[PDB]
DNA sequence: CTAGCGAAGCTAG
């Protein structure tokens, strides 16, 4: 059996105490966050470890930063993309714990279609491929999980016609989603549910949760031998309703053999 | 609207 929830915390530090809860109450086997905001030597390793983590993160201030946290110790961890070697921006973390192969991704937001953050998110992807495809070809059980920024169809989109060619829905980034999966990966929450909206990610603004309008654009990307064994993905909305929240609702996926 | 940086108003999401 394992359970793993992936996080897209914005400022780890303003959310510290909710990471801390979530490890407490029926806690993973693997939490990965994303968006920490905060530079490599300021992460509270000792606050986790206290409670009987193993961390492995990548840091930068300000912006970025992933991290995977995990019972088991993580093996064979790797920083970023083969094919991206000059990105200073802190976005892929992955390591091998239980035998599972973890990909921890933050991808790029994109801003506007129109955006030179567009064309390097383009660029980001296609190199993401890649590395996804070669670690593919090593682990057969593998999760490249996080945000992607890219909400997959229109049942992803509180709204489909405003939303119609913009920035995480055009037919461009689900091109790239759709690349993605292409290369082995199953959509595990669309596997255990094929309908319905499960937004989780909902704009701080103008009460957007509240009314429950939002986008599915953190997913849990699953080798086959992984949906074999898949059984259950979570929506933490829970989290999401939280005083002082992060805009982006924790994400669980659970397997066993 | 929120968070960072840093002292105000951009950048980023
Ligand atoms: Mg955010
Ligand atoms: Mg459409």
């Known amino acids: 059996a394992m359970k793993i929830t992936t996080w897209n915390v914005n400022s780890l530090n303003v959310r510290l105490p909710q990471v801390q809860n979530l490890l407490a109450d029926n806690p993973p ?11 490599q030597d300021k992460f509270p390793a000792a606050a986790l470890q206290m409670m009987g983590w ?17 019972r088991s110790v993580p093996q064979d961890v790797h920083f970023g993309l083969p094919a991206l070697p000059d990105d200073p921006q802190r976005r892929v973390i992955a390591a091998t714990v239980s035998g599972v192969r973890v990909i921890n991704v933050y991808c790029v937001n994109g801003e506007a ?16 491929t890649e590395f ?27 709204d489909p016609e405003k939303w119609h060619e913009k920035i995480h829905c055009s037919s461009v980034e689900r091109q790239w989603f759709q690349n993605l999966l292409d290369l ?9 549910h094929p309908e319905g909206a499960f937004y989780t990610w909902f704009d701080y603004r103008g009460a957007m949760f509240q009314r429950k309008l939002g986008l599915r654009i953190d997913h ?9 064994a898949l059984k259950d993905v979570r929506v933490d909305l829970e989290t999401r309703a939280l005083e002082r929240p992060s805009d982006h609702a924790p994400v669980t996926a659970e397997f066993d053999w």
């Not at 955006?115 to 190199?127: I, L, V």
């Open 113 to 128: 279609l129109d955006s030179p953050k567009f064309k390097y998110k383009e660029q980001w992807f296609a190199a993401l």
């Open 132 to 158: 996804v495809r070669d670690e593919m070809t090593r682990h057969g059980k593998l999760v490249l999980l996080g945000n992607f920024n890219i909400a997959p169809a229109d049942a992803d989109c509180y």
């Open 29 to 39: 086997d693997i939490l990965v966050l994303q968006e920490l905001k905060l530079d």
């Open 220 to 228: 849990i990307l699953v080798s086959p031998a992984m949906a074999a």
């Open 184 to 192: 082995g990966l199953t959509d595990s929450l669309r596997q255990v």
């Open 54 to 70: 193993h961390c492995v993160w990548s840091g930068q201030k300000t912006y970025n930063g992933v991290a995977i946290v995990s």
